[PDB]
Design a protein around this ligand. Structure first.
Ligand SMILES: [Pt+2]
Ligand SMILES: [Pt+2]
Ligand SMILES: [Pt+2]
Lengths: 199, 197
């Protein structure tokens, strides 16, 4: 395969790009790192002899090369705006999981709905929330947002009950045939979400 | 035309301002004294309204041809910019949540955080051009800003890194950028909001 994902045996920052690859029928190899790198971190991603680091770099690159970055330049910017919002919330989530889980979790969950609402609002403005997060075609931001929502449902079950378009969106994206099969597969299910047992 | 809405600080708008100025563009500053993510900057390009400084950088990158020569370079641009923003998130967290008790450790770790950019320059035409390829990209403006604010936080932080040192000098000497960097519109704004730097 021309694609290789080098990462810890976790879903982590590779979950979204993996969903993307699975859903667009792409083949890739997984290289596992048990407990060199430009920024001293994984994921590392190979596409032929191109070596990328940074999960969002990988998403944008797949977004550009597989046509999942909007239909024009304005949509592409909106895709970025969504992904940057997803990543802002991910940065807080990761800090929680890895540096303040037991003490911060109740404060984090309190603030959660106000950090989710912006995505509900975006959906409500795009064809009634019935298609994708931007435009009428799936983008890399949809896979990343989907992941973010899936991992938050585990952290704070019901956190989407207050948000009907986000709820239906998750169920709708999750039932895409190729993606539904992947999320059910051992390759996905048998990895933990993070690398410290907390979720 | 362009509108930038933001506080009277350099902050997250400094890079995209350097870009606009250096690319000979005109824009309106709407100074706020207090949205999609409850956050600024807000940016207007005609009917289009963007939030998030890196979204604004990528947009201008796309529309002005500052995003590499091809898809491979575009990915390397993103890689650099994402690395710049990882350190910027650290920097910001220091400034606002732990300046006086964190500063020592931050600066000790700083050479390790800068070296990857020296290394990238070293692997690209001997560090004599830009951070990726042969043309300036939105990532150059962002990295330049990171480097300027870090020279204020920890003067001499670049002495150990000749390619990055020459790079700041070269880019800073570009005519329109040089004029903008010397201007009161830049000089007379604080870097951050809480008066720490
Ligand atoms: Pt962060
Ligand atoms: Pt982070
Ligand atoms: Pt941050």
């Amino acid at each position: 395969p021309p694609y290789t994902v080098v990462y810890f045996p976790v879903r982590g920052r590779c979950a979204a790009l993996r969903m993307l690859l699975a859903d667009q029928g792409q083949s890739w190899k997984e290289e596992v790192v048990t407990v060199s790198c430009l920024y001293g971190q994984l994921p590392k991603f190979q596409d032929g002899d191109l070596t990328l680091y940074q999960s969002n770099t990988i998403l944008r690159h797949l977004g550009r090369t597989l046509g999942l970055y909007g239909k024009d330049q304005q949509e592409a910017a909106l895709v970025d705006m969504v992904n940057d919002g997803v990543e802002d919330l991910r940065c807080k989530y990761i800090s929680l999981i890895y540096t303040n889980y037991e003490a911060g979790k109740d404060d984090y969950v309190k603030a959660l709905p106000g950090q989710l609402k912006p995505f509900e609002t975006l959906l409500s403005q795009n064809q009634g929330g019935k298609t994708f997060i931007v435009g009428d075609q799936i983008s890399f931001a949809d896979y990343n947002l989907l992941d973010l929502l899936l991992i938050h449902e585990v952290l704070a079950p019901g956190c989407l009950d207050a948000f009907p378009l986000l709820s239906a969106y998750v169920g709708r994206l999750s039932a895409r045939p190729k993606l539904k099969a992947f999320l059910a597969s051992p390759e996905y299910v048998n990895l933990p979400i993070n690398g410290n047992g907390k979720q």
